[PDB]
């Protein structure tokens, strides 16, 4: 009973319990002639919440904050954007106005600015080269290399062995790689292989869009991109 677009009223957000102290957030947005869902993550960080990614636009991100307060009731104090596109940074200004400290890699921040997308305030150090990993409260942030975008990060939650792939990871039902305009199609299968090798104990894998599954999403992603 993972929410899909037909279950999510316009401008609304649903939360889904992944594990103890780990939720995904699902919202929908228009893109290229269709309505897409997209996923973000919420992780308990002590007495606070760590947010991964906006809910794709200001409206959705406002709804996300209201839904978190209603369902969980701990303050969101920090947010990480996993790449520079609007399903990851669109809503940063809302998060900042709400008192959330926003974070992204230096590369994500530079690309966001160049694209005219919203810019997270704070730079994440130690993610500049492929294979780099840093701890950020209750998660590990990992830079696997260029894939969906040159800057894309993935997020691992050690307590629950949850791998959040963002848009570098495709849902099983995906037939195409989606928006490849900023992708490195040559490097993407290799970046996915670095994810597979780094997180062999992953039990849940959450794509940027659509249904969670297992490690199979990673192979499926490699296969689709190769084709």
Write each residue from 134 to 173 as x if it is in contact with Zn ion (CB under 5 A), else as -, in one continuous string.
---------------------------------x------
Q: Looking at 9-17, 19-27, 57-65, 205-213, which segment touches Zn ion (CB under 5 A)?
A: 205-213
Per-residue HEC secondary structure of the chain comes to CCCCHHHCCCCCCEEEEEECCEEEEEEEEEECCEEEEEEEEEEEECCEEEEECCCCCHHHHHHHHHHHHHHCCCCEEEEECCCCCHHHHCCHHHHHHCCCEEEECHHHHHHHHHHCCCCCCEECCCCCCCCCEEEECCEEEECCCCCCCCCCCEEEECCCCEEEEECCCCCCCCCCCCCCCCCCCCCHHHHHHHHHHHCCCCCEEEECCCCCECCHHHHHHHHHHHC
Let me know if 152 is a catalytic residue. no
Nearest approach in angstroms of CB 148 to Zn ion is 5
Q: Is 85 annotated as a binding residue?
A: yes
Choice among 39, 45, 148, 220 that is catalytic: 148
At its nearest, how many Å lie between Zn ion and the CB of residue 200?
Answer: 25
Q: Report the alpha-carbon distance of residue 180 to residue 176 in Å, rounded.
A: 9
Site string for Zn ion, 14-43 (x = CB under 5 A): ------------------------------
Indicate which residue of 179, 182, 184, 198 is catalytic: 179
Which 74-103 positions form the footprint of Zn ion (CB under 5 A)?
85, 87
Residue 182 appears among annotated catalytic residues: no
d(CA 79, CA 122): 10
Contact range with Zn ion by CB under 5 A, out of 8-16, 128-136, 202-210, 212-220: 202-210
Distance (Å, whole) CA 37 – CA 222: 21
Please tell me the count of residues contacting Zn ion according to CB under 5 A.
4
Distance of CA 21 to the CA centre of its chain: 17
In the annotation, is 220 catalytic? no
Residue matched to tokens 């957030």: 25
Active site residue 85: yes
Decide whether 45 or 205 has the Cβ nearer to Zn ion: 205
Report how far Cα 1 is from the mean position of its chain's Cα atoms. Answer: 20
Compute the least distance from the CB of residue 38 to Zn ion, in Å.
6
208 binds Zn ion (CB under 5 A): yes
Nearest distance in Å: CB 133, Zn ion: 21
Q: Which residues are annotated as a binding site for Zn(2+)?
A: 83, 85, 87, 148, 167, 209
Report the binding-site residues: 83, 85, 87, 148, 167, 209
Q: Which residues are catalytic?
A: 83, 85, 87, 148, 179
Q: Which positions touch Zn ion (CB under 5 A)?
A: 85, 87, 167, 208
């Amino acid at each position: 009973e993972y929410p899909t677009v037909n279950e999510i009223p316009v401008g609304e957000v649903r939360l889904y319990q992944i594990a103890d102290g780990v939720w995904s957030h699902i919202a929908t947005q228009s893109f290229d002639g269709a309505v897409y869902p997209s996923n973000g993550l919420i992780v308990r960080d002590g007495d606070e919440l760590l947010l991964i990614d906006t809910a794709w636009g200001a409206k959705n991100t406002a709804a996300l904050l209201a839904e978190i307060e209603k369902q969980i009731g701990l303050p969101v104090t920090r947010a990480v954007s996993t790449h520079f596109h609007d399903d990851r940074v669109g809503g940063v200004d809302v998060l900042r106005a709400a008192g959330v400290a926003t974070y992204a890699s230096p590369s994500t921040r530079r690309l966001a600015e160049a694209e005219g997308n919203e810019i997270p305030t704070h730079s994440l150090e130690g993610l500049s080269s492929s294979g780099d990993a840093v701890r950020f409260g209750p998660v590990e942030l990992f830079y696997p290399g260029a894939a969906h975008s040159t800057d894309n990060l993935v997020v691992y939650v050690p307590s629950a062995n949850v791998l959040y792939g963002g848009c570098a990871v495709l849902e099983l039902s995906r037939t195409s790689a989606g928006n490849v305009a900023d992708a490195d199609l040559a490097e993407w299968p290799t970046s996915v292989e670095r994810i597979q090798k780094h997180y062999p104990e992953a039990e849940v894998v959450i794509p940027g869009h659509g249904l969670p599954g297992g490690l199979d999403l990673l192979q499926h992603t490699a296969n689709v991109v190769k084709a």
